């Protein structure tokens, strides 16, 4: 089928009924939110939202009788988790795209871009070491590795010179850890606060041979077509399902006493993000077309910002 996410019909106190793609005032308001909020606060909203979408937290009794299992983390290893898997894929792509658009569109000066880049890495650090949200941690890391972000030479140089510690933390700690996750070793290299949401993406993608991803990452080609790596994720998936509860356990501990900020909560919604990016009409075009669109838009903004 398709995603459960139906953006054209999503309502919000924070979104005009009829919005166009990348509305400038709305990208303005978004940036301001992430700009004016502490990275831990941002990461708590992301984790909290990821737990709803993956059905680790907030599962009504109707939803559970409906799944046949207690947790979405069990459900995704099963045939009837197909919808969930597709939802998981859409939110990840949309989130990675938004991050990129946040560096390449929601900024004015070089210094503003670099500050944004640092804030993004701090958020990623919070996701990893505090929230143990490996899933959204990976979406941010994917944004940072996009060819359109990677080639912003002047911007990475400003990061190296002004935000040095953050820049070294990213290259020396985050990148290598990211790589471990991708080789399917997450179960043996847990961050200091354990795991609340697993990486998910490479497992969900292996299962969904018809999955579209932005810029075609986790497409299991070339050096990825390794039985060894595929075994690691699938062995890990099975462990995930049997131990699904431990994740809930972690997320509940981390989020005890958490009180969400309404607007912040809204902008974490994939639906909302989809409306921001493709508008109230285009938000329901096919994945391939929607993703190809931003590949073009991001390459153009990157070129406008730092020409060769």
Q: Partners of 197 in the beta sheet? A: 133
Separation between Cα atoms, residue 30 and residue 40, nearest integer Å: 17
Determine contact, residues 182/203, Cβ cutoff 8 Å: no
Instruction: Quote the CA–CA distance of 179 and 77 in Å, as a whole number.
Output: 23
**Residue 209 CB-density burial (10 A; 0-12 exposed, 13-18 middle, 19+ buried):** exposed
Provide the CA 108 distance to its chain's centre, in angstroms.
24
Give CATH for domain 1-308: 1.10.840.10
Which residues have CB under 8 Å from 12's CB, separation 6+? 266, 269, 272
Structure tokens at 98: 């938004």
The values of phi and psi at residue 197, to 5°, are -130, 120
Q: Buried b vs exposed e over 280-299: b needs ≥16 C-beta within 10 Å? A: bebbbeebeebbebbbebbe
Q: Cα–Cα distance between 124 and 101 in angstroms, integer? A: 16
C-alpha angle with apex 100: 289 to 53, nearest 5 degrees?
A: 75
Q: What is the resolution of this structure in A?
A: 2.4
Q: Which two tokens stand for residue 70?
A: 């207690």
Cα–Cα distance list, 189 to 117, 195, 230 (Å): 26, 10, 18
Structure determined via:
X-ray
| Side-chain half-sphere CA neighbours of 127 within 13 A | 29
DSSP string, the chain: ---S--GGG---TTS-SS--TT-HHHHHHHHHHHHHS-HHHHHHHHHHHHHHHTTSS---HHHHHHHSSS-HHHHTTSGGGHHHHHHHHHHHHHHHHHHHHHHHTS--SHHHHHHHHHHHHHHHHHIIIII-BHHHHHHHHHHHHSHHHHT-HHHHHHHHHHSHHHHHHIIIIIHHHHHHHHTT-GGGS--TT--SB---HHHHHHH-TT---GGG-S---GGG--HHHHHHHHHHHHHHHHTHHHHHHHHHHHTTT----HHHHHHT-HHHHHHHHHHHHHTTS-HHHHHHHHHHHHHHHHHHHS--
- Residue 50: count other Cβ atoms within 10 Å of its Cβ: 28
Alpha-carbon span 203 to 182, nearest angstrom: 10
* Residue 274 CA neighbour count, 13 Å, CB half: 27
How far apart, in whole angstroms, are the C-alpha atoms of residue 132 and residue 53?
16
């Amino acid at each position: 089928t398709v995603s459960s996410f139906r953006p054209n019909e999503f309502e919000s106190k924070f979104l005009p009924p009829e919005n166009k793609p990348l509305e400038t005032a709305l990208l303005k308001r978004a940036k301001e939110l992430f700009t004016n909020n502490d990275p831990k606060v941002i990461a708590q909203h992301v984790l909290s939202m990821d737990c709803r979408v993956a059905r680790i937290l907030g599962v009504s009794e109707e939803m559970r009788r409906n799944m046949g299992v207690s947790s979405g983390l069990e459900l995704i290893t099963l045939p009837h988790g197909h919808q969930l898997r597709l939802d998981i894929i859409e939110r990840h792509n949309t989130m990675a795209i938004g991050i990129a658009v946040d560096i390449l569109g929601c900024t004015g000066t070089l210094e503003d871009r670099a500050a944004t880049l640092s804030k993004i890495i701090q958020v990623a650090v919070e996701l990893k070491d505090s929230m143990g949200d490996l899933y959204s941690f990976s979406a941010l890391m994917k944004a940072l590795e996009m060819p359109q972000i990677t080639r912003l030479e002047k911007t990475w140089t400003a990061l190296r010179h002004q935000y040095t510690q953050t820049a070294i933390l990213y290259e020396k700690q985050l990148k290598p850890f990211s790589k471990l996750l991708h080789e399917g070793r997450e179960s043996t290299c847990v961050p200091p606060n354990n795991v609340s949401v697993p990486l998910l993406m490479p497992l969900v993608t292996l299962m969904e041979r018809q999955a579209v991803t932005f810029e075609g990452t986790d497409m299991w080609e070339k050096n990825d077509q390794s039985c060894e790596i595929m075994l690691n994720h699938l062995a890990t998936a099975r462990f995930m399902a049997e131990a699904a509860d431990s994740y809930r356990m972690n997320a509940e501990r981390i989020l005890a006493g958490f009180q969400p900020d309404e607007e912040m909560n809204e902008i974490c919604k994939t639906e909302f993000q989809m409306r921001l990016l493709w508008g109230s009409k285009g938000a329901q075009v096919n994945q391939t077309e929607r993703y190809e669109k931003f590949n073009q838009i991001l390459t153009a903004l990157s070129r406008k910002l730092e020409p060769p």
